[PDB]
Structure 1
Amino acid sequence: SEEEIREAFRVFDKDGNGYISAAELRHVMTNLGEKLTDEEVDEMIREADIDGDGQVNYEEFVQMMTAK
């Protein structure tokens, strides 16, 4: 089900903008117990972002969750 992906997205978004920024992403990661540096966090975005905007959109979010 893709609901799992939507659920994860809902947990990531901190307002309902539909565009997960590095700040919101880091917030969730830190809450999970993952303490990474500025570079490490940005790297995650740089790999997920295919457009090259500086954030992860719904489409890219779905692809990253299905990555292998």
Structure 2
Amino acid sequence: MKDTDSEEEIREAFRVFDKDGNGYISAAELRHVMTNLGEKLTDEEVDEMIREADIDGDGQVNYEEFVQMMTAK
């Protein structure tokens, strides 16, 4: 309780995008919550927004990969 950012702050923000509670956030999970405010990411925009969120698997995001896209960016 002093000088800290709560490592949990991201533990939840992660599921905020991972609604399938499977462990990895799919592209639809990123375009579904990213538009919860109005933004409408298109397909060529989601796959590209994912390529930077994940490290280099196939095109999915995870908790350790979502952490970098959560705080920074």
Sort the TM-score into its range (normalised by shorter chain). Answer: 0.7 to 0.9
Given candidates 43, 48, 58, the residue that maps to 1:53 is 58
Taking structure 1 as the reference length, what is the TM-score of the superposition?
0.85
Can you give the 5+ residue segments of structure 2 that lack an aligned partner in the other structure?
A: 1-5
Q: How far is 1:59 from its partner?
A: 0.7
Q: How far is 1:27 from its partner?
A: 0.5
Alpha-carbon distance in structure 1 between the residues aligned to 2:64 and 2:15: 14
RMSD over aligned CA atoms reads 1.4
Taking structure 2 as the reference length, what is the TM-score of the superposition?
0.80
Q: Equivalent pairs: percent with the same residue? A: 100
Report which of the two has the higher share of helix. 1
Q: Please identify the structure whose Cα radius of gyration is greater.
A: 2
* Cα pair 2:53 2:65 within 8 Å, conserved: yes
State which drifts further: 58-67 or 16-25.
Answer: 58-67
SS of the aligned residue for 2:36 comes to helix
Instruction: Give the paired residue count.
Output: 68
Structure 1 residue ranges (4+ consecutive) displaced by more than 4 angstroms after TM superposition: none
State which drifts further: 45-54 or 20-29.
Answer: 45-54
Report which of the two has the higher share of strand. 1
